[PDB]
A paper describes a structure:
The conversion of S-adenosyl-l-homocysteine into adenosine and l-homocysteine plays an important role in the regulation of the methyl cycle. SAHH depends on the cofactor nicotinamide adenine dinucleotide in its oxidised form (NAD+), which is self-regenerated during the catalytic cycle.
Crystal structures of SAHH originating from [name] in complex with SlH and inosine as ligands, show architectural flexibility in the active site and offer deeper insights into the binding mode of hypoxanthine-containing substrates. Regarding the structures of PfuSAHH and MmaSAHH with their preferred substrates inosine or SIH, the oxygen attached to C6 seems to form additional hydrogen bonds with the carbonyl oxygen atoms of Asp348 (PfuSAHH) or Asp362 (MmaSAHH) in the main chains. This suggests that the hypoxanthine ring is in the imino-hydroxy form, although inosine has been shown to be most stable in the amino-oxo form in water. In the inosine bound complex, His298 is situated within the active site staging a His-IN conformation (gate shut) where its imidazole ring is oriented towards the γ-carboxylate group of Asp128 with a distance of 4.2 Å. The Nδ1 group of His298 is oriented to the O5´ group of inosine with a distance of 2.7 Å. To further investigate this observation, we used recombinant enzymes either previously preincubated at 95 °C or permanently handled at room temperature for crystallisation of the hyperthermophilic PfuSAHH in complex with inosine. Comparison of both structures showed no substantial differences in the conformation of the differently treated enzymes.
Residue numbers in the entry:
A (entry chain A), B (entry chain B), C (entry chain A), D (entry chain B): 1 to 421
The structure:
């Protein structure tokens, strides 16, 4: 309703509560605070314009204000129509961030707002899922030479960007922030493990313990979801298409079976494949009455909703973020968060300390593009490992943890080859 | 304020949303559904009057409607001023339950409303914390002879009632529902373990993994909170006064230390003692900046608020359910949910499937008083174990689990002595 | 071969290695060391004669030498023909303990040696499984009036003694050492959890992780076996006849099914029921090729060997403590330790620190009978809880652990009833 | 000493018991059985000569017999003097494998025997630790041109060989078997995790629950040892020099601290660094009386023995595989297995099912060298991932596990970029 040239938000008067959310989580993001203190002294982004597509909650807002405190002019659009937190977005507009996002946006508004954030003519694109980078190449080619580079936050976006590189139609360098150690080993695994179950408990008020929990995919996200489910008392069943990862899951104490077999016995289904149609018609037909389904991957195509809609004679909404599909035989299957990332739609996303480390890497990626975009080709690059090591050492210092250091004798010993028995 | 002779609630128009919540959780309470079916067929509480003091959310409402469906006239009052959900109690008033409760109500309203609930002149009293049973004994002795018996839901209430029995002031029989196997082994341990971290994550959006979590008390709630804290990645420290339970915690993999030593290193403190002043001035003086404190016990006297108030130079409110106490040296200590039951005040309480089991026991305890009050004494009794076994068997059938049965040969072997080596 | 009036052992020349085993574990039994220091100063067992039936390994030997250091004259027979460690027993004979035990004893030698230990005419009988107490009543009635009392170490023996009491034919008081908190919460649960898997790994050199482990019984032993199996990476399936314990196992994250269903899928079967014929013919007929079976209960009647012998066309012994039953269709099923307690026959029994606490209670039980046998009836008694608390406090002191103490205000608060909201 | 031109073993009569052990573990090695079947049908190593340096127990023997069954002439030498099992190597000599190994052999015999194994003039060298590959390069250059290539089994050996490649002294290609997915993710983590505690329990008979377990190194072995220590009830502390891995350990629930601080509080220390002098004088000076030390790394230089010797006033041997170092103040520190690979020297090594996977990779690496040596360079290569996938798929079939397969639609989606929101 408060919609103009410089922003489009639901209600500017929600800003006071948004500021409190941003201030609260920033108390627990020491790595990004450390970087912000530097950005304020050196203003490395003076004159630089930055367009961002991220999940617009209070940790994201602190990243954007950090970039703004480094002197950047910043625009923002939502990365998912339903992950936007309206009060936080109101606070970003009052701060001078050109943010275009209303929670519950239509698909068309999603793209209209993404285009409005692009109007800033960014030198740097910060993206989560690669929609903005894809949109620039497909509908806004008039500004590619202005773009120094982009960065991509999540696995599904990195896969899209690499296919763009393979097809030769990527036109500027992108940093695969998702591919950094301090990202996928912590965000994808520990962050999703906690916040997926946070979201599922919040939407349902159901018991995890003594449930058959079916985790589809045992990559970084899935093994984190499986680890925390087990930690909450569930019997965990893992579905994989990779035989090495299936054996890993067995060795971790989990049942491994295929999707039809898992569909007969699961109580709670969570998808984390990054793929399309992992759960479709013939799986829904086998599910027990009252089964709960949730998706943790980036796009809502992992649980195939049109198959659910075709099976159902009634579609009801008994709770916020719970869609009920009632089948011909009377069975009711429940889909959480409309099949979209359950941690960000039913809850508050990853915890503050996790996003601290991811978004610290995003800030260093943006600084990396600024400094090196002339040396880079239109390809997908990974940040140098020294940036991972810097982030880890700042985190450990803020926890009061001191680790052993290699002695010079040890350094020589590991580089040598004559010291056998 | 919508308050007639029959009810007193915040806002009757909220009732539609309370019904949805009640309908939702009831789909996942099979044991109580099974009991509700029989109560509707046989009407065993026809002409019986029941007054309840419970935490007034969804699952409590389904219990109260189950009793009413069995013929009972039911009155209800809050067990904690801040656990009440205003939309659920609006639905209960519309349904004919004489409920007197407003979220946030004053202590004076808490007791005024408890008296209004008692105006029904009950035959059975269902209590959570033993205030209502204590109130009849202190201010409403004119209806003691009408009361068949009471039932107590929680560990703190059972302790009070056995102290009343030891003192000779208990005037009618009391069923200690908390002492049933199907209660304290499931509700107190598995329920509290999950819902305590539900509430803490909900209030703070902070990471549990890699935190020092201090759990005070290693009784049934304490070991549940510890089990799930560990399941979520935390390093757990247990503080106990019972030496056997301290050893149990060690063997279970936890650090054990006293409260001063734990105060210096904890990031998150959770009390589960049912005692007074477990965490007090000298502990607050030792905690790290940004320590987070939560109480899982029934009364908010475990973390001693007045000592935080005396220590503080400012008291701020950065989030819902987060009080900030700022000390002279700039440290900020955070108290969740005002030091009250964090699972019920910052979240939705125990999961539906847990309360299904607890409240099935409450329904049966009410039936047990109806059928046995004429041959019970003014003492504290425990439900016969056949009822625990019935609740467990109904729950197992609803899960599709079929267990082995003792053969006659095995029963005779277990009662013999001549079959050694 | 070295067999006389005062002892019967395999080889006296093994004593030097037995002494080393006894000295080693005694370094890690501080509670029994504490008690031994007292026994040496007060000699409370001067003139007292003690007959013991225990598993004759090096922790048991230290208990017996502790009793001897208190001035007791001590005899000993094995509690299982196959748990005796010949070198330890040689060391006991050189110390003056009248020990009659050879590893691999026949059933008849087992009883002939048990009778020889009885020839001491004991005032106190220390028993594990209740064979000696049963033998005295059935074949050695000429010495009952000399016997002050007995104590019983394990669950299966306590069940036998209580049936003896119910039949009115128990003739002296017995202490149910197994029923003490510091016994079944630690020995039965944590001790058996570790040492069962110790024994199974040692006999087989097989991988626990990624196996279907079927635990029969979820009492104290079974839940300890299940907990450690899961900790070693196994998928754990629990078989129970108690619906409450079955639900507990579900809530702990384990699969629960009946024995036929478990027999089709288990890779490793462990029995811990204390019952007869939990695994019999129609379970063996469903087992996968190469299934491994082990028993942790006291008697070898839990896995019904005669059904295995009838099914097999060849019975082979591919490894020590592995019996191979080859079936008509070519399947091979492996029974460990001849179906006898796998932790004590395939390995070294419970770890030293666990037996420290159990055998400390056994020493205090013997001292309890000495001091109170005149006040006691021919019944089964449990040690007073103060002895449990003493043992726990000595253990905690030896670990360097200090616990919180209740303040006087807290003591009053927990005994009060007027402090509600 | 039974030593001809063709073998040198302790005692040929032990062979019957070695065969039983070999036959036993082979029943549980399905992947290697599958490969053995093909090797016998196709005889791909006919006329090929193979020299191996491995830990000579049962599973190693089945690998060597598998190679021989494929037509190979096989020689073998010990990878560690104290990991050799004299009965197994007796069976290998009887079978025609030219094995030169005695348990406890001197360092001079270790190298003499390695030279005897090399007297076969091998075409393929299979190594564990890279001594044999290092020995050919330093003392036996007269057969470098006959050698097709070598394979390295372990992390320490791969480090040495890549240092030889970086220095230009490597003269023939080398397969880093340790770097295969089906190796380091299973062998190094799950295998070492189980067999390290197998060996420690076997040597000490002490309780793991409620101990402070210090794990030095959080690589693949270290995190396996930590995972299973926690699974057995211990409080685990990780010591690392890598800051990312330190953070991983925290998030996994473990305390992280440096080695001096961990030295003061550990009860059990386990090194898994592959480095030198991780635990040294100043740490021994800080440890508690009765601390137990064990090494899981390939060379016994992680716990620095000479510093214990200088600190000690007595060195005693209270148990097999337990050295006692008594210090001036009476403290006794215990070193297990002489500081060598505790799983192999104090127990039976990794479980059969783990070595099945590792040694299946060795068999295929030997086949890979046979088929590709004419187009490889003097470099360190990793086996193609198709072989890892083949090993994992054979293992899954033998477990009865059927996993889902990527549809063609899913493969095309994973390679597209236009399908966003
Ligand atoms: N906050 C969040 O919810 C969050 C955080 C990080 C990543 N993600 C999203 O999660 C998804 C994956 O994250 P990752 O980092 O785990 O990817 P990853 O590639 O490590 O794991 C993907 C796994 O899915 C498996 N898989 C693919 N199709 C499958 C199928 N049909 N059945 C079973 N298994 C299948 C693959 O074998 C692979 O192991 C992506 O969409 C990523 O964007 C979400
Ligand atoms: N939040 C919920 O929904 C929920 C659920 C069940 C019970 N409860 C409440 O939780 C509390 C405990 O329930 P329980 O069933 O665990 O009781 P319990 O007696 O099982 O456990 C209490 C433990 O606290 C220990 N303790 C007492 N004072 C202590 C101190 N000063 N320092 C350290 N340890 C101390 C005691 O030794 C005892 O082991 C009660 O108030 C009960 O009503 C709350
Ligand atoms: N060192 C050891 O190996 C060791 C240590 C302590 C006790 N024990 C022995 O272990 C056995 C039990 O020990 P406890 O203390 O666990 O007994 P417990 O009674 O706590 O557990 C016994 C369980 O077995 C279950 N059960 C009985 N028959 C069953 C059946 N047919 N199928 C499935 N479950 C069945 C019962 O429901 C009960 O829960 C006894 O024989 C005891 O002597 C051995
Ligand atoms: N016992 C077995 O059967 C077995 C099995 C596999 C590997 N290994 C041996 O175990 C060792 C490690 O194997 P990996 O595969 O774990 O190696 P790796 O490199 O995965 O892990 C080594 C870790 O040690 C850490 N580290 C190095 N020096 C350290 C120090 N001074 N203090 C603390 N941490 C330190 C490094 O940071 C690294 O993370 C190697 O020697 C390998 O050959 C033994
Ligand atoms: O609370 C959050 N704020 C911002 N980004 C988040 C939060 N939680 C997860 N992600 C990010 O969302 C991506 C999936 O689209 C993941 O890569 C994750 O890093
Ligand atoms: O969601 C809930 N509804 C009703 N009661 C609850 C819920 N969660 C916990 N308790 C109950 O509160 C008592 C402590 O005062 C506990 O006994 C528990 O059974
Ligand atoms: O190492 C040991 N020494 C002596 N007794 C033991 C050991 N391990 C277990 N038990 C005891 O054996 C009983 C079963 O018959 C159990 O009660 C246990 O306490
Ligand atoms: O039982 C075994 N037999 C043969 N090799 C083994 C066994 N257990 C571990 N290793 C191997 O020893 C190497 C360290 O030197 C590890 O790489 C591991 O694969």
């Amino acid at each position: 309703m408060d919609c103009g040239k410089d922003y489009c938000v639901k209600d500017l008067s929600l800003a006071e509560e948004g500021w409190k959310k941003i201030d609260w989580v920033s108390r627990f993001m020491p790595v990004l605070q450390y970087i912000k203190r530097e950005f304020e002294e050196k203003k490395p982004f003076k004159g630089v314009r930055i367009a961002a597509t991220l999940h617009l909650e209070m940790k994201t807002a602190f990243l954007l204000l950090t970039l703004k405190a480094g002197g950047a002019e910043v625009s923002a659009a939502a990365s998912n129509p339903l992950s936007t937190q309206d009060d936080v977005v109101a606070a970003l507009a009052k701060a001078g961030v050109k943010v275009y996002a209303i929670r519950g946006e239509s698909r068309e508004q999603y793209y209209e707002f993404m285009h409005k954030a692009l109007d800033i003519r960014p030198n740097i694109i910060i993206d989560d899922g690669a929609d903005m980078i894809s949109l620039v190449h497909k509908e806004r080619q008039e500004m590619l030479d202005e773009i120094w580079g982009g960065s991509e936050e999540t696995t599904t976006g990195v896969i899209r960007l690499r296919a763009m590189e393979k097809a030769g139609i990527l036109k500027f360098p992108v940093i695969a922030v998702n591919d950094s150690y301090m990202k996928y080993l912590f965000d994808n695994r520990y962050g999703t493990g906690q916040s997926t179950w946070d979201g599922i408990m919040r939407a349902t008020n159901l018991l995890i313990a003594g449930k058959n929990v079916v985790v589809v995919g045992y990559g970084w996200c899935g093994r984190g979801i499986a680890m925390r489910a087990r930690g909450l008392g569930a019997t965990v069943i893992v579905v994989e298409v990779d035989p090495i990862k299936a054996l890993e899951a067995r060795m971790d104490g989990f049942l491994v079976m295929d999707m039809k077999e898992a569909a007969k016995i699961g109580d709670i289904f969570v998808t984390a494949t990054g793929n399309i149609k992992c759960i479709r018609r013939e799986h829904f037909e086998l599910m027990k009455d009252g089964a709960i389904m949730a998706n943790a991957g980036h796009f809502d195509v992992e649980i195939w909703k049109p198959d659910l809609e075709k099976l159902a004679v009634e579609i009801n909404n008994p709770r916020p973020n719970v869609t009920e599909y009632k089948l011909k035989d009377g069975r009711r299957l429940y889909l959480l968060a409309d099949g979209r990332l359950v941690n960000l739609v039913a809850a508050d996303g990853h915890p503050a300390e996790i996003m601290d480390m991811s978004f610290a890497l995003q800030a260093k990626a943006a600084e990396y593009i600024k400094d090196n975009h002339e040396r880079l080709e239109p390809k997908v690059y990974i940040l140098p490992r020294e940036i991972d090591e810097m982030v880890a050492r700042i985190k450990l210092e803020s926890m009061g943890i001191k680790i052993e250091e290699l002695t010079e004798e040890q350094k020589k010993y590991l580089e040598s080859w004559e010291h056998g028995t």
